[PDB]
Amino acid sequence: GASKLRAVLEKLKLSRDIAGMVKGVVDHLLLRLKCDSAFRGVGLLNYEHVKISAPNEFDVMFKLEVPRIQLEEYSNTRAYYFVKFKKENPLSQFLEGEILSASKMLSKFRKIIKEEINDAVTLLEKISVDITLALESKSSWPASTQEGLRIQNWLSAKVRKQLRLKPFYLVPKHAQEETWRLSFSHIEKEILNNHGKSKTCCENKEEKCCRKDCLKLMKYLLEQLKERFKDKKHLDKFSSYHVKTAFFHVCTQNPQDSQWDRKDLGLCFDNCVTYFLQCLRTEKLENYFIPEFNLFSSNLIDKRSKEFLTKQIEYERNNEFPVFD
């Protein structure tokens, strides 16, 4: 009974000329940001719609390369780090000790943005834009990612070796307000747009896979229930990031394109539901890149919250997903 899923995927495409006009404003923001000494080498990372149900909301990431870093891990959190330096730092005014202050460099970031309005941050009638700034280190990835990104049986060890030569990024997130969180935003995009074991996956009629459709249906399912139960607040800590990482673990578990054939959209999606449910019950959802970081730990999400989402998802599947209508 995948015809209901196929219909949903067609309506989600309906709500997709949606348009590129924040690329004007982001271009004008990027001009005066380079005029400052601290943000000279800042360029755009990639639109990127976090919410697949709100095409009128975008998200862009601004990257600034840092020349010389020695990273310092906060406690055993393995995802949050202190950024310490090894010429003349243009971010020397953001130094609180040996630690580049996240808060300091963010404050300057919003100031110049609030100075271009008269001509992290979210910008205004029916469109919004979420802006994030990230450090770029072209160095080797930290030791916590050594066992992550298990794509060797799927996209090959050769591709994993090439992806890990690319730079990694750090975004400002509290852990304590002096920490930076690892981010591989660029890698998840590259993998999803180059997702088959076959290099010609989805390029011909004989190799049509349903990986991308399963991810979309997964994100739509969570957003729909997040708005259905928007009052209880039990679902507020659940985001499409959790759904994406679970989908990537499923791709690792099912590496052949034979296991994602478009005919089997029903079972593929159902197996994506099931793995997500299993992570909820056992309270275990490892970061795809940082395998010892548990997104579904009791420290970050309450068990009662996961039990409510499990109950609702199981209800939806048992009744042919009325959430989609």
Using CB under 8 A as the criterion, which residues of the chain lie in contact with its own copies when the complex forms?
Answer: 152-153, 155-159, 194, 196-200, 203
Instruction: Record the tokens describing residue 96, joined without a space.
Output: 């609180």
Side chain identity at 123, as an amino acid letter? L
Q: Given the DSSP bridges, would you call strands 121-123 and 42-44 parallel, antiparallel or unpaired? A: unpaired
User: What does the per-residue mask of binding to ligand EQR show for 253-292, with x meaning CB under 6 A?
Assistant: ----------------------------------x--x--
**240 a known binding residue?**
yes
On the CB side of 225, CA atoms within 13 Å amount to 24
Quick one: which of 101, 137, 179, 185 contacts ligand EQR (CB under 6 A)?
Answer: 185
Q: How far is the CB of 315 from its own copies (least distance, A)?
A: 39
Under 8 Å CB-to-CB from 196, ≥6 apart: which residues?
Answer: 202, 207, 209, 211, 257
Q: How far is the CB of 50 from its own copies (least distance, A)?
A: 25
Q: Which is nearer to ligand EQR, 54 or 201 (CB)?
A: 54
Tell me if 209 contacts Zn ion by CB under 5 A.
yes
Tell me if 183 contacts ligand EQR by CB under 6 A.
yes
**126 a known binding residue?**
no
**202 a known binding residue?**
yes
Number of residues that bind ligand EQR (CB under 6 A): 13
Tell me if 184 contacts ligand EQR by CB under 6 A.
yes
Q: Which is nearer to its own copies, 205 or 304 (CB)?
A: 205
Q: How far is the CB of 207 from its own copies (least distance, A)?
A: 10
Q: How far is the CB of 78 from ligand EQR (least distance, A)?
A: 8
Burial group, residue 150, by CB count within 10 angstroms (0-12, 13-18, 19+): middle
Tell me if 293 contacts ligand EQR by CB under 6 A.
yes
**Alpha-carbon distances, residue 85 vs 71, 89, 159, 251 (angstroms):** 8, 9, 30, 37
- Contact region with Zn ion (CB under 5 A), list: 111-119, 137-145, 191-199, 317-325: 191-199
E strand or H helix at 308, and its extent? helix 303-318
Instruction: Record the tokens describing residue 232, joined without a space.
Output: 């209880």
> Are 17 and 67 within 8 A, CB to CB?
no
**Alpha-carbon distances, residue 14 vs 26, 226, 269 (angstroms):** 26, 22, 21
Neighbours of 106 (CB within 10 A): 15
Q: How far apart are the C-alpha atoms of 137 and 187, rounded to whole Å?
A: 14
Q: How far apart are the C-alpha atoms of 143 and 317, rounded to whole Å?
A: 40
**184 a known binding residue?**
yes
Q: How far is the CB of 154 from its own copies (least distance, A)?
A: 8
Tokens 């160095």 identify what position? 139
Quick one: which of 2, 71, 135, 202 contacts Zn ion (CB under 5 A)?
Answer: 202
- Site residues, ligand EQR (CB under 6 A): 79, 181-185, 239, 241, 287, 290, 293, 295, 300
Binding positions for Zn(2+) are: 195, 201-202, 209
- Site residues, Zn ion (CB under 5 A): 196, 201-202, 209
